[PDB]
């Protein structure tokens, strides 16, 4: 649709040239990912997120390149309020930006560390992004994508704390199919995906790694932590030797037993180790939807 094609120097101004230091200390740069750090801005008194295009992780020039014109038709095609809105971008000499709605609130993954000192996320409202993240991702589904990079990086925060799912560059189009290019973030795969596999099925896993981190505040992965990974507290849990109780985070008054067990079993439901055996989105969004 109507993207704002801007020059890079102009991006380069907005940005202070992209000031590498963080926002909270009053530099430009908020964050990063895989492909790329994403600044603050002011373009014609519009708070904007300019992200600088980088291959961060092992793909190629040329991928990278494919990855900004796939994120630009998926944002020209799918507007959706739990999903990030694209404003322009700028493709002029060697470097790629994007342009985006500058959301107040960060990410799900920082909020839940408190990274920068904000305060703990309430039940209540860890509920609310809940089912928003489910709702964004139902419509992508409706409307035949596959995510494949959904992780609580990729799940913004405006000023209401409405979630807004971002980073749309590894999107495909949607009968499960292969690649040979494994692309993602190993902590949050479903195991078909570290496979090879694509298909909506691993974008369901991912949330339930997402909804896992929601109830307990703690990463996904942590390499001076037992276990490494977060998937692995559902194998102690159903073994009996935890319980959800065990792993809930602690940096909230507001949390009832009966809707953290709710939240919990459409975790453990995502969470499935078979694709065909896990809900589809509707069933996720009826059952957050259910708990509240
Ligand atoms: C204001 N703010 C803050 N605060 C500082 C702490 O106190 C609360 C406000 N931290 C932010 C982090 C990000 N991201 C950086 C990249 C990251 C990895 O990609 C994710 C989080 C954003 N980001 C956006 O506004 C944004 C908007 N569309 N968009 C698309 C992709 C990535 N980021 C964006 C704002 C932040
Ligand atoms: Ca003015």
Known sequence: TR??????????????????????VGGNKMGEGGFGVVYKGYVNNTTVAVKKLAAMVDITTEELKQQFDQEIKVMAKCQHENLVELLGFSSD????????????????????????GTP?????????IAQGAANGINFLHENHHIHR???????????????????????????????????????????????????????????????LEIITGLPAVDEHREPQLLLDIKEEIEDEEK??????????????????????????????????????????????????
Request: hydrophobic residues 35%; aromatic residues 8%.
């Open 3 to 24: 993207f704002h094609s801007f020059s890079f120097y102009e991006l380069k101004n907005v940005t202070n040239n992209f000031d590498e230091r963080p926002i909270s």
């Open 93 to 116: 000499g060697d470097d790629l930006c994007l342009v985006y709605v500058y959301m107040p609130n960060g990410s799900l993954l920082d909020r839940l560390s408190c990274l920068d």
């Open 120 to 128: 703990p996320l309430s039940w209540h409202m860890r509920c609310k």
């Open 149 to 211: 990079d959904i992780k609580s990086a990729n799940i913004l925060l405006d000023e209401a704390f409405t979630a807004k799912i971002s980073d749309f560059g590894l999107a495909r189009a949607s009968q499960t199919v292969m690649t040979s290019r494994i692309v993602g973030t190993t902590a949050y795969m479903a195991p078909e995906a570290l496979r090879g596999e694509i298909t909506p099925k691993s974008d369901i896993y991912s949330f339930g790694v997402v909804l």
């Open 243 to 292: 319980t959800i109780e065990d792993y809930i985070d602690k940096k909230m008054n507001d949390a009832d037993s009966t809707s953290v067990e709710a939240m919990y079993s459409v975790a453990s439901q995502c969470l499935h180790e078979k694709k065909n055996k896990r809900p589809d989105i509707k069933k996720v969004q009826q059952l957050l939807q259910e708990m509240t």
